Structures are given as C-alpha cells and as structure tokens.
C-alpha cells in the first residue's frame, strides 16, 4: 500500500499509521507541540485494492481530540488520496466539528498535504 | 429563471435577489434579526441557460459581512442549485471565511436550504 509509516503535514504535525491488509488504518496523530499531551488515537479506512491505472489510493481517518491529558470536545476527519512515487504524498481535505456549539456553525474545513519528509 | 425574488433559510434569514438576463445576481441578505443593521449587499452569478433535462440551475453568491453599522471581518459564499416547481428550493453549501485569523483555521462550512415560504 505505501501508506504504513510516518507522515508530516506542512504545519509541524505528524501521524503514524499502520495500514492493515483488510483496509484498516490505526495509529497516532501528534500535534506540532510533540509532547505526550499532543498524542491522540486515530482510526480510519483505506482502499486496499486501488485502480492500477488511477492517480492514487483513497483513504480517510478520524481523530477525536481527547486523550488522557486534555479534551477539546471535537473531532476531525481527513478524507484524501495517497499518491506514491519518489515524492509520495497524502493529499487531504478535513472537517473539524465541535461538540459543544450548535451544529450549524460547528464545523471548520481545511486541507493538509502530508509528506514523508518534514517541511 | 424562477430565481428573482425572496427566499428564506431554515434559520430565519432572508435574501432578496434579482437574476439578470446576463447571469448576474444582485440583492440583499438579511440576517434573522431583521433590522437595518442586519442587511448586507450580495452579489453573484447563475447559469442563465440551464439544461432542460437536468435537475436544476447552478448559482452562487457572496456576502461580505460589513455594512454601514457593523463589520464582522468575514465573507460567506453560497454555492448551490435552484430547483423549481411547486416546492421551489435553492439547495446550498456555504463557506464562511474570517479575515482576522490565520487562514488555515479560518473557514467554516455548512449548508442552507432556501424556500419561498418561511420555516
């Protein structure tokens, strides 16, 4: 798959993921401060048989922003595509929803480009 | 076009739009408080020759949240589709960007369904 391992966004965050043979993604997302309190569980799914002709491999994952240190009462999902080669990347769009505020103004949208080397 | 006139979202906001023969949209968006300070300029575009076979008519508009009363240093764009008939609707998704905060966490996403009758 080429997905298993460590990936870096352009803001200093990291995640570390294992891609299972079945389509499972499991790992840890680490925000840019990089300490214990910056580590969060992630889980998701990916296409374990992508088109050989196509551009990439579809995938998505979720982080709920609670760990044993802190709780930001929110969750982010990243939806995107892994592209292999010499400059491998995971191109994503993300949705960050807050649990605390009313739903219709609760969700931020953005994008992240993950690489195998740091920015 | 069926677009010119007044439309209501499901939260109590209104807008009033004129659809020009050329594709122009011009009007006023009025937030749910409904007073002078709640009125904002809107401008946008629409498909002035939609497919006769298709589901609807593509359109979009922008409101910058400044009027002569107040300034929320932000802008919302709605992108969507007008559907005619007895229960006409404009189905939209929107992006609200703040100017003041750093761009990567600056944009909320949501949706609005506009009807010709109030909720």
């Amino acid at each position: 798959a080429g997905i298993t391992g460590t990936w870096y966004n352009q803001l200093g965050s990291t995640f570390i993921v294992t891609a299972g043979a079945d389509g499972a993604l499991t790992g840890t997302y680490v925000t840019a401060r990089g300490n214990a309190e910056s580590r969060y569980v992630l889980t998701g799914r990916y296409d374990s048989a992508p088109a050989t002709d196509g551009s990439g491999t579809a995938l998505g994952w979720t982080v709920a922003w609670k760990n044993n240190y802190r709780n930001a009462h929110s969750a982010t999902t990243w939806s995107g595509q892994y592209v292999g080669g010499a400059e491998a990347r995971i191109n994503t769009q993300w949705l960050l929803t807050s649990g605390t505020t009313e739903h219709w103004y609760s969700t931020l949208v953005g994008h992240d480009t993950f690489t195998k080397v740091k920015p | 076009a069926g677009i010119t006139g007044t439309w209501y979202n499901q939260l109590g906001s209104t807008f009033i739009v004129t659809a020009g023969a050329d594709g122009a949209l011009t009007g006023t968006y009025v937030t749910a408080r409904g007073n002078a300070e709640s009125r904002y300029v809107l401008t946008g575009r629409y498909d002035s020759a939609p497919a006769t076979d298709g589901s609807g008519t593509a359109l979009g508009w922008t409101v910058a949240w400044k009027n002569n009363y107040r300034n929320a240093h932000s802008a919302t764009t709605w992108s969507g589709q007008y559907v005619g008939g007895a229960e006409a609707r404009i189905n939209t998704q929107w992006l609200l960007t703040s100017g003041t905060t750093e761009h990567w966490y600056s944009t909320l996403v949501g949706h609005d369904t506009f009807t010709k009758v109030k909720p």
Binding site: T31, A32, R33, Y40, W65, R70, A72 | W104, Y105
Partner: peptide, 9 residues
C-alpha cells in the same frame, strides 16, 4: 479555533 490542538504551534 486558533487555540485548538490541531493548529497549535
């Protein structure tokens, strides 16, 4: 959201 963990510096 500037203080949310996702965007922390």
């Amino acid at each position: 959201a500037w203080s949310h963990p996702q965007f922390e510096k």
